[PDB]
Amino acid sequence: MSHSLTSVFQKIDSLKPQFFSRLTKAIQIPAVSSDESLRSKVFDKAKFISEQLSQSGFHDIKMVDLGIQPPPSTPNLSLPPVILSRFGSDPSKKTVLVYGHYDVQPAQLEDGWDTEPFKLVIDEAKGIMKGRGVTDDTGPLLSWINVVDAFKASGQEFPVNLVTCFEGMEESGSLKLDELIKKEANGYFKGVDAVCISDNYWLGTKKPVLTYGLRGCNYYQTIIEGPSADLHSGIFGGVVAEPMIDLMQVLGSLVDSKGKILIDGIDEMVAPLTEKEKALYKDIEFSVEELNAATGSKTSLYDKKEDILMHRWRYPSLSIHGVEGAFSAQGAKTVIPAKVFGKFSIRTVPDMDSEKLTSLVQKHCDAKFKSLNSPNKCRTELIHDGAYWVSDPFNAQFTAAKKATKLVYGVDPDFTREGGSIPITLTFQDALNTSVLLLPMGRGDDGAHSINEKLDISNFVGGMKTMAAYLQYYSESPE
């Protein structure tokens, strides 16, 4: 019970009522960063969090202004502030920086939610919390504060100096955060010894994991324009060229129904499969039956465990998200859309270069479009990019985290990679020159970016205790 972790573990149980309360208030402020009309909510969310920091012991609190929303439509809307804080300033202790994000994906009841997405429903009988942002990423984020509180209530010494970096643009490209970290590497973040992030999930639903790899993400829109305004599809049908028709062809040329990306040049950039990397992949626990459970269907593209895992983790993927600018409500509308935007993204792996990938994508789309012999205008542009990240899971942090997991969940965690992405992870590693650990709180069926997003209370509590032991053990590790 290192400096009595049992004391801390006990307080974590006792304080569940205030933790729940804190988490309810947070979830109720709909910090949807992608929604301009809710930007003010995003600020209230940041404000609420800074208030929790301050009520707990945190100091040197800074609501950092990245500036005005820019990049590639903004009415001079300010960006959500990045929240920096410290807890403790003992020069003999290690300093751990924790990062998370307080903005959240959009959500509406009518999307199919069983409960209202921004009313956090807590069911201690089933042991689940249902609400948008509860696993991605407001639950895990607030967990760091809960943990500070538990050390406090248990009268136990906090094992490290905590430093916080909470942004509110993660669901919207993490704009400008990149620059902040680099700018502050020899400033607010000067003394950092390590970075921990809780912003992903267990592979499955039964066994905890530690994550040593993330895919990157390149998000594209293909824009096709024709007439100057929408056209009655009857008056002009068969006589003017249709952006929607070209677009089905261009979009339909990016990837097949088996998952094979059809863009020339990508496969060449994909790092080959090594025996070293192959070692780690075995002994994982996972089956397609689990994938089917999370999916809610039998629609996997692979049956072999090795295949499912490798195609989630280390082979790229291309997904097609939807069309902007056409007719998307229910029923019928007889219209020829004037200007449409096809949405699609690529999950990047080593060793894919962002730049080259974008060129390849443009080259492919331009060429396909030109082969249509269409009078329409067309071009493909990048909306946002985020780097992939791979690390060796043997350094001090993973060891500390491994013992922590073992302590709480009674088994050693699998070592896994992630299909998902956390864009700044690489920026933390390189800019600060420290190791990064990913410590998933929730399960792989939590429904992030979907309806009925849930966090199991067992993962909530288990994850907090795991965060507590991890900080404790890390503080004890010789390096």
Neighbouring residues of 296: CB distance < 8 A, sequence distance ≥ 6: none
- Choose from Zn ion, a second copy, none: what does 76 bind? Cβ within 5-8 Å by kind: none
Q: Of 103, 184, 193, 456, which is the active-site residue?
A: 103
CB-nearer residue toward a second copy: 92 or 373: 373
Neighbouring residues of 326: CB distance < 8 A, sequence distance ≥ 6: 244, 337, 340
In the complex, the smallest distance separating the C-beta of residue 329 from a second copy, rounded to whole angstroms, is 7
Neighbouring residues of 361: CB distance < 8 A, sequence distance ≥ 6: 218, 220, 263, 346, 380
Q: Is 304 in the site for a second copy (CB under 8 A)?
A: no
Neighbouring residues of 96: CB distance < 8 A, sequence distance ≥ 6: 160, 161, 162, 163, 192, 193, 194, 195, 196, 471, 474
Query: Where does this chain touch a second copy (CB under 8 A) — which range of 23-31, 81-89, 181-189, 228-236?
Result: 228-236
Q: Is 345 in the site for a second copy (CB under 8 A)?
A: yes
- Residues 250-279 interacting with Zn ion (rule: CB under 5 A): none
Q: Is 172 in the site for a second copy (CB under 8 A)?
A: yes
Going by the DSSP 8-state scheme, the letter that residue 259 receives in this structure is S
Q: What is the DSSP string of 159-181?
A: -SEEEEEEES-GGGTTTTHHHHH
Annotated binding site: 101, 136, 171, 199, 449
Q: Is 228 in the site for a second copy (CB under 8 A)?
A: yes
CB-nearer residue toward a second copy: 88 or 204: 204
In the complex, the smallest distance separating the C-beta of residue 189 from a second copy, rounded to whole angstroms, is 27
Q: Is 266 in the site for a second copy (CB under 8 A)?
A: no
Per CB under 5 A, the list member of 103, 136, 242, 453 interacting with Zn ion is: 136
Q: Of 137, 149, 167, 170, which is the active-site residue?
A: 170
Per CB under 5 A, the list member of 178, 199, 385, 453 interacting with Zn ion is: 199
d(CA 341, CA 323): 6
Is 268 designated active site?
Answer: no
Q: Is 305 in the site for a second copy (CB under 8 A)?
A: no
d(CA 190, CA 10): 34
Going by the DSSP 8-state scheme, the letter that residue 273 receives in this structure is P
Per CB under 8 A, the list member of 156, 161, 376, 425 interacting with a second copy is: 376
Query: Where does this chain touch Zn ion (CB under 5 A) — which range of 196-204, 393-401, 407-415, 450-458?
Result: 196-204
Instruction: Indicate the SS3 state at residue 314.
Output: coil
Instruction: Say how many residues touch a second copy, by CB under 8 A.
Output: 100
Here the tokens at position 276 are: 């070293």
* Contact characters 61-100, a second copy, x per CB under 8 A: ------------x---------------------------
- Choose from Zn ion, a second copy, none: what does 434 bind? Cβ within 5-8 Å by kind: none
Burial class of residue 4 (count of CB atoms within 10 Å of its CB; 0-12, 13-18, 19+): middle
- Choose from a second copy, Zn ion, none: what does 199 bind? Cβ within 5-8 Å by kind: Zn ion
Q: Is 298 in the site for a second copy (CB under 8 A)?
A: yes
CA distances from 221 to 4, 226, 343 (A): 53, 16, 5
CB-nearer residue toward a second copy: 49 or 217: 217
Q: Which residue matches tokens 């948008």?
A: 132
- Choose from Zn ion, a second copy, none: what does 41 bind? Cβ within 5-8 Å by kind: none
Would you tell me the crossing angle of helices 396-409 and 457-476 to the nearest 10 degrees? 140
CB-nearer residue toward a second copy: 282 or 298: 298
CB-nearer residue toward Zn ion: 342 or 420: 420
Per CB under 8 A, the list member of 116, 230, 366, 381 interacting with a second copy is: 230
Per CB under 8 A, the list member of 61, 153, 396, 451 interacting with a second copy is: 451
d(CA 304, CA 474): 36
Annotated binding site for Zn(2+): 101, 136, 171, 199, 449
d(CA 135, CA 456): 9
Q: Which residue matches tokens 């965060």?
A: 467
Q: Which residue matches tokens 């700018």?
A: 183
CB-nearer residue toward a second copy: 294 or 396: 294
Is 110 designated active site?
Answer: no
Q: Is 423 in the site for a second copy (CB under 8 A)?
A: no
Q: Is 168 in the site for a second copy (CB under 8 A)?
A: no
Going by the DSSP 8-state scheme, the letter that residue 41 receives in this structure is H
CB-nearer residue toward a second copy: 171 or 193: 171
Neighbouring residues of 162: CB distance < 8 A, sequence distance ≥ 6: 58, 86, 87, 88, 95, 96, 98, 144, 148, 471
Q: What is the DSSP string of 357-379?
A: HHHHHHHHHHHHHHTT--SSEEE
Residues taking part in catalysis:
103, 170
Residues that bind Zn ion (CB under 5 A): 136, 199
